[PDB]
Amino acid sequence: TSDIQTYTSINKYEVPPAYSRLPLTFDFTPFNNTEYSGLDPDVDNHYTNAIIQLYRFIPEMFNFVVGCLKDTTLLTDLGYLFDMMERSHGKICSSSNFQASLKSLTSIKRNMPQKFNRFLLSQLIKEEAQTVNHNITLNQCFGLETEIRTECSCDHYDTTVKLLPSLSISGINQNILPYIEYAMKNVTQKNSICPTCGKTETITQECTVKNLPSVLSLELSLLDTEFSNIRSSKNWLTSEFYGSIIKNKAVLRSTASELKGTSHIFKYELNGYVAKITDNNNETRLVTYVKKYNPKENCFKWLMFNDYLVVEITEEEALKMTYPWKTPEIIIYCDAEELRKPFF
Ligand SMILES: [Zn+2]
């Protein structure tokens, strides 16, 4: 017999109590002894709660969103929500209102967490645009400047530059750094019909991310076979790394000095991630790992959120990818200095 907040087991195949499917939702205090609020799972699309928690713990993000309340829209709803979650004392909060706003805009399936992540960021960034203020903060925080050049025979496929708020990660050909590097610079081929010519042709496209934004939001979009190689790789989920734009390419390394012939080096730290838990029943759910700075003790602590259960955990557990019941879904890296700023 174990307390529900027990978050390890001996055998890697047994889902520990803290990760289990919690009772339907009335006291939740036995599930949470922290000062951080969990979310009521009795809402539509309750898997979005894991992603709401994730963003709630990005300082640049929290602070900007709650700041808007001092100026209707699911930005401001997210504002009210974040604010309730901070000042509530670990008391449960509801994403009810936020869910409503989302709906108005008319089992965890493959890609749905990633799809919701892209939608949410894009939607927040667009609303941020709707203020005649400027009012760029989210755009500049998450914005990946992505250039697509096309080698083609017909001279049409004009180069495009779009600002994307997240980076989609697919397989390469071990740790996470080369995956991110590949997503930020790659050359691919595909069959295509030219919108201008109508010619069908194999085109070659070079996709280049131009900048290293202060928040990198990663959507893992891998095959389950690729996930099996991730679990076998110890230390796949790198906790911190250094990046630089070197010769029009993003280069990412574990240490700063591995970065050569570049004049500006940026440090990133893992802030949090959302993971899918798969039960023995094959029942499925999202949890959230986050890292929060305690500037008095000059250290970070790691928290795991499972709906309304919240438990402080070791960094070892927080970075462990080897559990067959665990799959990373969405990962956030954050400028190391930003990560230490206070939540207002
Ligand atoms: Zn053409």
UniProtKB/Swiss-Prot annotation:
**Span within the entire protein?**
461 to 863 of 1115
Record: residues binding Zn(2+): C154, H156, C194, C197
- Please state which protein family the record places this protein in: Belongs to the peptidase C19 family. PAN2 subfamily.
Q: Outline the extent of the USP domain.
A: 14-336
The subunit field of the Swiss-Prot or TrEMBL record says: Forms a heterotrimer with an asymmetric homodimer of the regulatory subunit PAN3 to form the poly(A)-nuclease (PAN) deadenylation complex.
Its UniProt miscellaneous note says: Present with 1510 molecules/cell in log phase SD medium.
Q: Which domain of life is it from?
A: Eukaryota
Q: Where in the cell is it found?
A: Cytoplasm
Q: What does this protein do?
A: Catalytic subunit of the poly(A)-nuclease (PAN) deadenylation complex, one of two cytoplasmic mRNA deadenylases involved in mRNA turnover. PAN specifically shortens poly(A) tails of RNA and the activity is stimulated by poly(A)-binding protein PAB1. PAN deadenylation is followed by rapid degradation of the shortened mRNA tails by the CCR4-NOT complex. Deadenylated mRNAs are then degraded by two alternative mechanisms, namely exosome-mediated 3'-5' exonucleolytic degradation, or deadenylation-dependent mRNA decaping by DCP1-DCP2 and subsequent 5'-3' exonucleolytic degradation by XRN1.
Give the protein's recorded name.
PAN2-PAN3 deadenylation complex catalytic subunit PAN2
Gene behind this protein: PAN2
Free-text note on domains in this protein's UniProt record = Contains a pseudo-UCH domain. This ubiquitin C-terminal hydrolase (UCH)-like or ubiquitin specific protease (USP)-like domain is predicted to be catalytically inactive because it lacks the active site catalytic triad characteristic of thiol proteases, with residues at the equivalent structural positions that are incompatible with catalysis, and it cannot bind ubiquitin. It functions as a structural scaffold for intra- and intermolecular interactions in the complex. The linker, or PAN3 interaction domain (PID), between the WD40 repeats and the pseudo-UCH domain mediates interaction with PAN3.
